Design a binder for this molecule. Structure first.
Ligand SMILES: [Zn+2]
Ligand SMILES: [Zn+2]
Lengths: 423, 289
């Protein structure tokens, strides 16, 4: 059943998408063999579906029981004025077929409920929560945890919208002996609209779904290895798009907050969880605004060249250590004043040699709260440095921040010191 | 077209959900309906921008494009249809906009924008959106916007990323450098995935709506400065980086603050020799970059 080759028609339609680095024929076949479920055919669901249909997701399921109304067309741009009164799912698929008739579209002409949630979700690979409903959002996350599904959730309100990837790669309920991605309860313990806001989050949802399928981000890591922290999966990002009608794009229009992993005491995914699929069906979790404050924001792991310089000029980073991990001869061409050179090549060997005293890799420290900042050539290996330093308990249980500079010394040149001698 | 002082019964129902947003209301809606927004380019950037300006009720929407719909671009140009392959992009896009909302007036320009016609196309419009995704054309549009006093919302695809910036808003006449003024595109500078270009396009519409509703393109009170919190005189360069092997991260979005108008800018700076006559005659020359 799995499709392994491309036809002449598919090569034409997808040619300009396959040349994107990291896509190719393999990435395209992964999309065409994938099954994505979209719950909600409105403000979030329309843009999400448009771009998943165009990209060539093989099977697209759409769940919605409401109908097209004139008052919602301003934000539901996949519907037509001529199709007012039609079921949203029927209206949306009509437009998706126009974009791309090759995918198989599966309508669910009813709303998701605790009684049918598991039945609807089980066959699908990636789940997109395009409901703007809190109750349904908690229900979907619960089911995705119990059924082992990755979830891309979005929400919108008057002035802001949000997006987050949850339970990806999925980890069974109750597992707390390893690093695991959070669920929606881990992140948010229970307490008009502008088109661009909901449209933004919807397009971003499709973007994440495409990434997950093409790169197989929902597949487990190699036995004994943890997911790369650089993939932003086990500690996903909470994207928040703030839309203020009286201010153009600002520094905090797009805010990305790093979340913690699975909570050990989470009602749904934590240990000693009482949540079950039959309990949901029986109404045991009673799924009583649309966006609420998070409850597991994690300590920051990175800093921009701009922000690091801004703090250095104002003397804010007191007592801190600055580690330059470029190789010796590269460090000799110039560096940030005050940077100590600890080449990455030797660093990995010395770290390999601590499988026996304590922490000789590093240099003279002060207090237990003294931040460490890592910088490399262009920010490709510095996250791995930070990750192993934390693996050896040199963050002192979280009291000591360990960060790297985004973009390395290249970003330093581009953002702060254009005349820096970069190699 | 720009003289509406009332909303009809159909418009009240169609726009009820967005008027109730704080800062919009009836005054905000009439400002959209009395506005004229030009969209240069009917492709990956232009389709999402047009869709959301149409739904929101911008009274007059112009679209400039001379190319045709192709099958290999549908993955990113989602306002087009497979059965409309071979049709002009401008006509195929307006077909879908009319579906979304038939109340606005749509003005197609069925031909390429060029140095010989840029001023003719741009002059009648209030806010300009550059959706060309062509570096050379970007400089042409910026230049003309500076000379004709227009606010410009420009977006682009670059490598594995997208970009967006609001320029010359509120517009300031060429050569004025004795006050704070917004930059032009020169002041700032010298295979694509659908969601990338789609997100920038939606962002472009969100900015055009901001400008018209809050009148961000109007001058400040005499002797008063433009509030820096509006991010206009020193705008932000939004950069969204999209990597297929990494979920959205904390710095996939970079907001770089730009400087104001440069005193020595070739186009908007002091002693500028750029003119509308020159642009028409090939001076400067917009070399393909
Ligand atoms: Zn949880
Ligand atoms: Zn300039």
């Amino acid at each position: 059943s799995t499709q392994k080759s491309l036809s002449k028609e598919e090569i034409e339609r997808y040619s300009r998408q396959m040349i994107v680095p990291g896509m190719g024929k393999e990435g395209q076949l992964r999309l065409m063999n994938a099954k994505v479920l979209i719950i909600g055919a409105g403000g979030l669901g329309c843009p999400a579906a448009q771009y998943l249909a165009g990209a060539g997701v093989g099977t697209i399921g759409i769940v919605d029981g409401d109908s097209v109304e004139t008052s919602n067309l301003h934000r539901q741009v996949a519907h037509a004025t001529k199709r007012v009164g039609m079921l949203k799912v029927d209206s949306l698929i009509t437009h998706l077929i126009e974009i791309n008739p090759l995918p198989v579209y599966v309508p669910y002409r009813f709303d998701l409920t605790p009684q049918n949630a598991a039945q609807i979700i089980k066959p699908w690979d990636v789940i997109l929560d395009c409901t703007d409903n809190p109750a349904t959002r908690y229900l979907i996350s619960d089911v995705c945890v119990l059924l082992g599904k990755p979830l891309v959730s979005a929400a919108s309100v008057q002035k802001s919208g949000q997006l987050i990837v949850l339970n990806c790669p999925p980890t069974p309920q109750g597992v707390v002996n390893k690093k695991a991605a959070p669920c929606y309860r881990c992140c948010f313990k229970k307490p008009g609209i502008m088109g661009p806001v909901v449209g933004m989050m919807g397009v971003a949802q499709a973007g994440e779904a495409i990434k997950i399928l093409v790169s197989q981000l929902h597949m487990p890591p190699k036995e004994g290895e943890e997911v790369s922290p650089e993939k932003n999966l086990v500690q996903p990002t909470l994207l928040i798009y703030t839309y203020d009608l009286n201010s153009a794009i600002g520094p905090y229009s797009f805010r990305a907050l790093k979340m913690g992993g699975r909570k050990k005491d989470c009602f749904a995914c934590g240990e000693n969880s009482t949540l079950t699929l039959d309990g949901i069906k029986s109404g045991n979790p009673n799924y009583v605004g649309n966006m609420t404050q998070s409850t597991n924001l994690a300590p920051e792991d990175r800093i921009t060249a701009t922000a690091y310089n801004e703090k250095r000029r104002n003397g804010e980073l007191g007592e801190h250590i600055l580690l330059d991990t470029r190789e010796k001869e590269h460090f000799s061409f110039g560096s940030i004043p005050g940077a100590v050179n600890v080449p990455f090549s030797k660093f990995l060997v010395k770290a390999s040699s601590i499988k026996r005293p304590a922490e000789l890799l590093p240099m003279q420290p002060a207090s237990d709260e003294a931040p460490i900042v890592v910088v490399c050539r262009r920010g490709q290996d510095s996250q791995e440095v930070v990750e192993k330093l934390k693996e050896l308990g040199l963050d002192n249980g979280g009291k000591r921040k360990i960060m790297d500079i985004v973009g390395g010394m290249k970003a330093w040149r581009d953002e702060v010191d254009p005349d820096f001698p970069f190699i | 077209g720009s003289t509406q002082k009332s909303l009809s019964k159909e418009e009240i129902e169609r726009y009820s959900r967005q008027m109730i947003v704080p800062g919009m209301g009836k005054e905000g809606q009439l400002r959209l309906m009395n506005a004229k927004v030009l969209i240069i380019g009917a492709g990956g950037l232009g389709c999402p921008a047009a869709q959301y300006l149409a739904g929101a009720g911008v009274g007059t929407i112009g679209i400039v494009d001379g190319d045709s719909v192709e099958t290999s671009n549908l993955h990113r140009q989602v306002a087009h249809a497979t059965k409309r392959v071979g049709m002009l992009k401008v006509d195929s896009l307006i077909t879908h906009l009319i579906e979304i909302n038939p109340l606005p007036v749509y003005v197609p320009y069925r031909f390429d924008l060029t140095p010989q016609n840029a001023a003719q196309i741009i002059k009648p419009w209030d806010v300009i959106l550059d959706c060309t995704d062509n570096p050379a054309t970007r400089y042409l549009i910026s230049d003309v916007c500076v000379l004709l006093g227009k606010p410009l919302v420009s977006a682009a695809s670059v490598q594995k990323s997208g970009q967006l910036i609001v320029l010359n808003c509120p517009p300031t006449p060429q050569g004025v450098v004795n006050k704070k003024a917004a930059p032009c595109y020169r002041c700032c500078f010298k295979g694509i995935m659908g969601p990338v270009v789609g997100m920038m396009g939606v962002a472009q519409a969100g900015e055009a709506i901001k400008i018209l509703v809050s009148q961000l393109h109007m001058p400040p009170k005499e002797g008063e400065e433009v509030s820096p919190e509006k991010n206009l005189v020193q705008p932000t360069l939004l950069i969204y980086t999209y990597d297929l092997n990494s979920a959205i991260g904390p710095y996939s979005f970079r907001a770089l603050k730009m400087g104001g108008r440069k005193k020595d800018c070739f186009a908007c700076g002091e002693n500028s020799t750029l003119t509308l006559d020159g642009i028409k005659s090939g001076n400067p020359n917009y070399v393909q970059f």
